[PDB]
Amino acid sequence: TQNINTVDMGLGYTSNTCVAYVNRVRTDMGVRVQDLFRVFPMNVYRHDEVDRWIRHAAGVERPQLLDTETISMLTFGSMSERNAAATVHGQKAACELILTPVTMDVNYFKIPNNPRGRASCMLAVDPYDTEAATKAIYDHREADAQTFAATHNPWASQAGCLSDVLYNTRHRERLGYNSKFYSPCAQYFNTEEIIAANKTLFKTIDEYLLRAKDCIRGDTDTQYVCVEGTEQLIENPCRLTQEALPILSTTTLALMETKLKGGAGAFATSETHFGNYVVGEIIPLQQSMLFNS
Amino acid sequence: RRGYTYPFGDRGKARDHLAVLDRTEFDTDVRHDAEIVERALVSAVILAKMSVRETLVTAIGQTEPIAFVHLKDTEVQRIEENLEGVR
Amino acid sequence: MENWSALELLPKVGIPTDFLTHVKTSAGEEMFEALRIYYGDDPERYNIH
Amino acid sequence: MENWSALELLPKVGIPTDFLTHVKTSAGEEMFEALRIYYGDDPERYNIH
Amino acid sequence: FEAIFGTFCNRLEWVYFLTSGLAAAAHAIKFHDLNKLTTGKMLFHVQVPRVASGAGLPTSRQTTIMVTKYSEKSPITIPFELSAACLTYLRETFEGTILDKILNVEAMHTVLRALKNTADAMERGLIHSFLQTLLRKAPPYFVVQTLVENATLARQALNRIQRSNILQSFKAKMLATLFLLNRTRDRDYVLKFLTRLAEAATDSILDNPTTYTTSSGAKISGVMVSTANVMQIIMSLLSSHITKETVSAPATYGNFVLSPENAVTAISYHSILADFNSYKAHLTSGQPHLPNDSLSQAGAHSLTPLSMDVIRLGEKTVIMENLRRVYKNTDTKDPLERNVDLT
Amino acid sequence: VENATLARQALNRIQRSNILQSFKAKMLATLFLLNRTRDRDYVLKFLTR
Amino acid sequence: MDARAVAKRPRDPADEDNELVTALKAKREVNTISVRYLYHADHQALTARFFVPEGLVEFEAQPGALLIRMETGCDSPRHLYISLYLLGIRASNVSASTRCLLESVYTASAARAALQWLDLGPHLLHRRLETLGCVKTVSLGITSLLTCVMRGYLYNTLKTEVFALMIPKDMYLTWEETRGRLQYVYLIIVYDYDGPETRPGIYVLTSSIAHWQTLVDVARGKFARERCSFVNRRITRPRQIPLCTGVIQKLGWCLADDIHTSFLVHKELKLSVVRLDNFSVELGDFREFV
Amino acid sequence: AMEANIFCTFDHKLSIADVGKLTKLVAAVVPIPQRLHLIKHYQLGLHQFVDHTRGYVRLRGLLRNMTLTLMRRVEGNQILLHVPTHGLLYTVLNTGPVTWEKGDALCVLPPLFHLLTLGQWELVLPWIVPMPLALEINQRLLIMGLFSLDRSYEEVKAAVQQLQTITFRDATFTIPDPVIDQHLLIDMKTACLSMSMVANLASELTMTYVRKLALEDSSMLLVKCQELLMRLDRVSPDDEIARLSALFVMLRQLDDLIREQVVFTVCDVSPDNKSATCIFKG
Amino acid sequence: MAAMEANIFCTFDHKLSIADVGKLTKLVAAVVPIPQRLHLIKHYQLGLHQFVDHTRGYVRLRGLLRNMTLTLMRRVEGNQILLHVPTHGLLYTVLNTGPVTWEKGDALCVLPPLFHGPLARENLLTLGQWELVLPWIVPMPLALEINQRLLIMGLFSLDRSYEEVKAAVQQLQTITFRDATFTIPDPVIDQHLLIDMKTACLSMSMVANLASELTMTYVRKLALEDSSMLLVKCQELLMRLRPQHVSPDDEIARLSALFVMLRQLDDLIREQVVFTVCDVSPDNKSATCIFKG
């Protein structure tokens, strides 16, 4: 045993962590859905026949009548779903919200905007101001400054909404869930500590370094919240800006085809047909990631 | 009560059939008493045939016949004459 | 809180100090752990218990 | 309120000390102002931090 | 028969903390009495410069900030295990026969082999914990990039307009250079980004002028570190700026011994003040400026030359460092190889 | 030579998935190497790899 | 064999050199590890490491508390480590003010999860819990680390601090004003056989009696209301089979001249406690008495 | 500084593979009939005790008073047994059929399910098992011995089928039957006869003795007791002396099953679950 | 205070003869009861001579002897007795004083003496109206027999005459354990015996209630089919004169409580193991022993 201790004798910050070379994507980089039946396992339709019909038609197995001690463990934390039979692609991870079909998609899917509905930047408010921050988050008589409508998804940007009770962890504890499961939407809905993180700028930086990251069990085919020591924390810039990046998305294979054919940096532009549209991939990480070498 | 404290060849399907048997409440109109008493009878006969340790037909689609389990035949013909007389 | 009078009266080491931001900006946003900003001329360092 | 460890580890003068009553009586009747009477021996005095 | 050829035992390659190039960011000081302190504080009395103003302007007041700064401790441990058969063959002979010498020499050599392996593990764990403590106090690129440019505006406490500009440039520089060396292979752009990085972070307060000086009087400003293949990319792309040559390093840890006067304040007032005799001398004399730091004099006095990689950029010669040797055949990850979640 | 640091245990499912992905990436690009490219530095880098 | 070896004085087990020293000096090397006095060599506190979540580590940063483990029937945690202060909710002997206080400190998931696990099966607590001893250290990360002491004293390393076991005042129980010179301390769990209020009575008895028959004989005469309650629930609800009206086990012994009072502080929530300074741990299994 | 090590010699030629088999059983428990100094292998374990017509309980009664030694080292032509003392801590192998955890209390049991073998010798080692499974095995075996006479019926075969298996954490394990060829062994016959005798005398004499005591009833407890006994119930004094002595001798012929002294308590198990560290207890 | 010291120096305050010290040096490695546990005690507390009441209640003395401290005697020199206190599980020898024969592998127990009279001729230190009476160390069968016979005499003395209880006293007091005769010195009815009788009768009613159907009728079933000498010896101590229901999940809890009740019964006569001899001397005067105290 060697007791050591360091004195960080630099007045300013004396060390910088630049990011250099990405080479592998351990996720699938594709499209699946979060298994919400596995997230909340003990929510049964009160009539028996409609529940069996729904669980059979959705392709989801019965909860096997988990006894109350296992239920208390599942509220404490447990891994439920086994890994798949085989996977050439990466680990599955995705999620789902509920959107209004006439939202301002030109301002809300071409630039990085928060999918909660409003500009939820914790840094923009004054420090130690919980009232002004929760008014910026929850009130709808003032507009946010990023998009000057007060709302871009009224099913998602109000307190106690659908995606609040599905994705705010404080509301999720009242329904009971697998805490070992990771949900990538909750980092935009954890207003229990978004309020508690609106500090001064350098305090926000050091609060971003330690304990703002997340832990992911890499080995298992599904994503799991890890424990510290088995795996290091995973650095995340989306926790700082409270944004999310627009990956490209066609609604018709013609647009995917004419994006694939041209090439040479033709990915960041948004091209809009009558009913069909592509949004620009903002950082070309589908253009020259694999072909660089 | 007698099915709670009894050992079976399998516990799960015995518990399932007993769960169908208990909490049995009849409606006030007489039309839907027959199907509820019939599902009670098929659950009771499944407990009967499995508790005496003999096989039941496990073919999907065909239900097991409502019959008496291991009886002396003079009481059986007594049951036939009584049930025909009330027919 | 520490004895800032001990920081004031005792001899120091002359260092060409420089950091990236302004001094008052790093002070009002608490870049460090604990700070102490007397603004005029405090007589408290001339009292020794 | 006072490190009594800092009483044992330092050296000290040897004085013939005479109290009016018995020393435990003047101890337990708090004629003094702060006392740390302990029986036996404590290893509290050694682990200096 | 079968032909058993000569057995192969892997020689444990050795790496020490000072002979590795990572020690340039550190300041190695040995101190035997480390198991009896709580925190190592370090205070600063920073007077600011003011400036005379014109008529009607608000006059700036003569003010001065004071700031403490503490230490962080993280002890490093290793278990190693011994069988009781090794013990009972170590300290005990069995009638002095030839079948006892084999087991006794085997037990002693196994014990000393495990001790050398544990010492090398303790050195590598010191390197690992030092790199962890350095990386925990490391802001990313975009924050210091926005802070080196907009510091000349925000001279008061941070306003809402200034934090709005800082957040906009946060998003701008974050969307600019998340993956730079994967994106572009420009020589001049990568070198300009690296010298902007070198001028971005500020230096420390103290440095021994005799340490980390190369041949021909060149003075090292710092050390950068990366993994193997990105260092290969830098060595293949920035090859016109790598002057592979020797450098000076401290040979041993500098010692730190408390005075006989220091034990008195250690016992009574539960505190330790270094350079105590110089403090009472300069206080009795009245010259209020020490010639050097207390912690700087306690460093090394002997130097060793050793070959390393130094790059010249903006006349800020910095040491490039590869960390393949420290974590080869180990059971932990490199702390430099993280993962990033772009949601 | 690219994924050697991450096998600090016996390699699990997702790591050999990445290995197979890099098999598919490398086998299609580096199959007939002197027939696609004839730059001196690319063949130099390939020979030193 | 010869007379000199049995006529020699016994070899000093500490003043002889260590196994590392007699391995080094026979081959004459040097290493950066200082060796010549190994720590913990003159120790008899038989320690055991333990991993705990954050919800059960409150009231444990101050050393000395009973690390009593439990088991849940669910297969993913096979055991859990309750503190004695966390058992006070299920303790019927704990007063309502003290219970309302210590429920305002264990408001993490693990504590209330254990509370739900305690009162769920068809068993009592004596076949649900299992006693280990006292905790002396804490690493205190998020997942903490505790080092209990099964047998021996409670001391810091290098013997410079004799740690002390505290128990809350609502579980302390002495039975004679004339306390003996040496006294032992036992863990009594009684049961009031009320229907809804089957929450047990927790007691930490400190008596001079070391025998077992003369302890349970004077223990029948101090819980005769609960004994008659056992017979009462036996007669008014027949064809239910309860058992183990009370259970005791030997926890240890103290010196009886230093059992005093103190108060724990944890996030400025004080709590009056009975403190046992020179505690020893000598475990006994859960015996029962009717 | 050698410790107490019983030198256990052998009486048979062994191959190198025999010693390589035996050197896997280092940190295991061994029962020894007498705390001796030099011993053969014929008094080493339980195969000297195993009788054809005597069973589990008579093995257990000859298991309460055995010095539970270990095997510190094995070498040429000898074994070094290591007697443990109460207070120290020793490594014990997980040679039982059921795994352990951290914090359990461990005790000894005969091996119900089935090592060195010779022509007349088979080296057999006792099961080491946590306390709740031990009590479960006792209460399983006594009741399964109690279903001996009425074995002919068709329901009770399914009942003893249910009673035959136990459940621990991931241990769906079953035991052999005490009754062989529809008649009980004399060991379990005595074990069940003692229980039936103490029940049949308690249901007979306690009423008379509690109504004798009821005049000197000085508590609010014995009256509820005799009311309970009265609600259940709906000669020369040398017979009473003989009946009370019969009651206490059938109690005295029962104490091998009524309890189990804790021997080991684990402190930390090895990873991959093959050994543990246990403080020995009396 | 200081802790339990390993050494208790017993000092004889009287003057002494030579022959009394000659008897005293023969009594090394014997057991003594000590109530005080000081360092330099006198001889008054040494031995059981402080406990001889004018009734000499044997159940009272039996209850009081376990409350004292068993201690070994060593270093018999001039007016010094080094009393070695015991520790948990070490190995040091003993020396018996009673005429009770010992074998190997058995346990031992502390007990008040038997057939107390000068016909036995205890040469036990006559001086100053004070005789050092030593506690007997007896094996477990003799101790269990004397405790069960004392409990039989206690339970039998209810609602009976002053001649039939004397007829039971003259019959029961003879013990013939291992070819030697021991009578019971002055057994009296006592309140300690009364409360032990009370606990015994309560436990007897609890086993009378908690016994199930088959658990009582098993001997009646066995008397129809099997016939042995044991069954004819016990069935003529019982009364003279196809399971209807069976539920093993009920009988498991029935016997789980039944073993607890039988433990609560049998703990009143099987007191405490205090010595377990590994091996003896062939002249049966001393023995190497385990677990002092």
Author numbering:
A (entry chain C): 1078 to 1370
B (entry chain 1): 89 to 175
C (entry chain Z), D (entry chain B): 1 to 49
E (entry chain C): 50 to 392
F (entry chain D): 197 to 245
G (entry chain m): 1 to 290
H (entry chain o): 3 to 116, 124 to 243, 259 to 306
I (entry chain n): 1 to 241, 255 to 306
Quote the paper.
We present the in situ structures of the symmetry-mismatched portal and the capsid vertex-specific components (CVSCs) of HCMV. There are four major components of HCMV capsids: the major capsid protein (MCP), the triplex dimer (Tri2), the triplex monomer (Tri1), and the smallest capsid protein (SCP). In this study, we show that the portal of HCMV is composed of a 12-fold symmetric (C12) main body, a 5-fold symmetric (C5) 10-helix anchor, and a 6-fold symmetric (C6) turret, and is specifically adapted to pack its large genome. The main functions of the herpesvirus capsid are to package, transport, and deliver the viral genome.
Through 3D classification and refinement with C5 symmetry applied, we identified the portal vertex and resolved its structure at a resolution of 4.2 Å, revealing high-resolution tegument densities similar to the CVSCs of other herpesviruses. Unlike the icosahedral reconstruction, which showed that each triplex of the viral nucleocapsid was exclusively associated with three copies of pp150, our C1 reconstruction of the portal vertex revealed two types of tegument densities. The first presents with two copies of pp150 associated with the periportal triplex Tc. The other, lying on periportal triplexes Ta and Tc, is completely different but reminiscent of those of CVSCs from other herpesviruses. In addition, our C5 portal vertex structure revealed 10 short (27 residues) fragments of helix-loop, which are structurally similar to each other and are all located close to the portal main body. The 10-helix anchor contains 10 aileron domains arranged with 5-fold symmetry and appears as a helical ring surrounding the portal. The C-terminal loops of the 10 aileron domains consistently point to the portal wing domains. Through hydrophobic interactions, the helix anchor is tightly held in place by the capsid floor regions of the P1 and P6 MCPs. Each of the 10 fragments of the 10-helix anchor is strongly associated with the capsid floor, and interacts with the pDNA. We surmise that perhaps this 10-helix anchor—unique to HCMV—functions to dampen this squeezing/tightening process.
